[PDB]
From a paper:
Membrane-attack complex/perforin (MACPF) proteins are transmembrane pore-forming proteins that are important in both human immunity and the virulence of pathogens. The crystal structure of a bacterial MACPF-domain-containing protein BT_3439 (Bth-MACPF) from B. thetaiotaomicron, a predominant member of the mammalian intestinal microbiota, has been determined. Bth-MACPF contains a membrane-attack complex/perforin (MACPF) domain and two novel C-terminal domains that resemble ribonuclease H and interleukin 8, respectively. The entire protein adopts a flat crescent shape, characteristic of other MACPF proteins, that may be important for oligomerization.
The data were indexed in the orthorhombic space group P212121 and the structure was determined at 2.46 Å resolution with two molecules per asymmetric unit using the MAD method. The final model of Bth-MACPF contains residues A/B36–558, 239 waters and other solvent molecules that were present in the crystallization or cryoprotection reagents, including one MPD [(4S)-2-methyl-2,4-pentanediol] molecule, one chloride ion and three ethylene glycol molecules. Furthermore, Bth-MACPF is likely to be a monomer in solution, as supported by crystal-packing analysis and analytical size-exclusion chromatography (data not shown). The MACPF domain contains two four-stranded β-sheets (A and B) in the central core, which is decorated by several helical insertions. Insertions between β1–β2 and β3–β4 (TMH1 and TMH2, respectively) correspond to the so-called TMH regions of CDCs, which unfold and form transmembrane β-hairpins. TMH1 (residues 126–173) contains one helix (αB) and two short 310-­helices that pack against the inner surface of the B sheet. TMH2 (residues 248–304) contains an antiparallel αβ–βα structure that sits on the outer surface of the B sheet. In contrast, D2 and D3 of Bth-MACPF, which are distant from the TMH regions, seem more likely to play a role in protein–protein interaction (e.g. polymerization or interaction with BT_3442) rather than membrane attachment. The shape of Bth-MACPF appears to be self-complementary, which could facilitate ring-like self-assembly to form pores across membranes. A model with 16 copies of Bth-MACPF forms a doughnut-shaped molecule with an inner radius of 110 Å, similar in pore size to the the C9 MACPF model.
Numbering used by the authors: 36 to 56, 66 to 276, 287 to 481, 484 to 558
Amino acid sequence: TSEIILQERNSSLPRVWSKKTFTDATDFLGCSYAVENGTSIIGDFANAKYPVVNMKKLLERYPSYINPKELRTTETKALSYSDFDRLEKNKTFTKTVKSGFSLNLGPFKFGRQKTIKETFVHNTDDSEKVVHGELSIEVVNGMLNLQTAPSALRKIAADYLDELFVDALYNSSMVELMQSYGEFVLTGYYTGGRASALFYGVDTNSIQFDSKEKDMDVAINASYEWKNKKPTGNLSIGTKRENSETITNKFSALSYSIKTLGGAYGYSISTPPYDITNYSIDLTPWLQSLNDPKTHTMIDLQDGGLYPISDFILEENFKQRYNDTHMDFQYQESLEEPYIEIIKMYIRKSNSGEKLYDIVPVLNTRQGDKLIFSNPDAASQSDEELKANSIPATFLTKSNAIKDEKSKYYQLKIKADPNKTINPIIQLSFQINNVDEKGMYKFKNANTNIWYIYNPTSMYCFAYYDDDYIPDAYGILDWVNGIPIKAVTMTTLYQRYKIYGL
Ligand SMILES: [Cl-]
């Protein structure tokens, strides 16, 4: 509203903010994993999407980053849940994600409900009577782990990312990247075969969450048979005769659908829904197909076997955006026009209680991050100086002076606005102190084709994949071409610099 342009985006610059560019069980490691848009079966190989880590390249240099271990066990787990928050009553999915990460369960819960609704015939059912069930039957044969020491993860980020993942990182929005890849990277899983069954019951007489869950607990447990459960037997789902009374005594209807993971002679595609007392399926051939380990696949996740994508990238702003987007704090559908806004940054309250501000250029990136170019010596200044930034006349002079300077390096829209505040001291924005376009060097990483432009006095760095369309979006191609080439090692860069992706 009181926004005023100080420089139109140079009109000869283009307006382009983006470009739209499993043999065996061990190949899932370092791939993205889809929660929201997957099958909702935890650890299901189908939810493995695309490679994030270039594993072949990594293992060619450091073979010890991978660590397989033979297992020979069987596992059954049953879960009953009256609603989609109760889905996580045993933290089944929660504990698969890296300990300490801020996990948003919404998408997982949404995906399960979406699947339930697609798997089971459309209903008039009174949700009060509804309870859900899940069964897992697993022949476990192996275990795969990627090294996850932070220093390992940084090395991977720097040099061992899949080039199409690097593409998505710089040529689409984080939103788009998560739609295509999913939200997590596979670091720890189990291999073998698995039968997975979902149940949908209408409890005849209980509406209490716990009572219905105990009813489902009993039903699930009366509804399958594993005789002689040897690892490394007969298996069937469905009740008959005596066991059917166990079900009908508590449920007016209980239906199920199964899906087998790996093996042969099973059910690769989720089955239509069947009444538990009417239709039984013999999985015996499928179970004994699992004696051929060639038929094995990814079947479940290790605790902490899923790492956020943010652990696999160096860029501060992408890391934060991934996190914020996952948490539903931010959502930019697609990359946009960058611009510098000269606005006010909160510093402190005067001894009269008055808010005092510095005037600051803030680069808005394609991704919509705000990179505040702060003056850390602004806090030293005396109250009356800072208060003079509230005078329209000093704002004119300073804003125009900053524009005159930054204009030498950036040909994008520069605007000023005396009524816009940005507060990084109390709060997405980032602070980069002592930004100075004159003090920079650059080098290209040969493995990844990323340019890293770094200021070795102030310890900040702007990164971008090597396609001129990007510097052109910021109208900085001239400037960057003039920047002298000076290599620094990746480890020095990420250990000693803050890196921001343009
Ligand atoms: Cl049926």
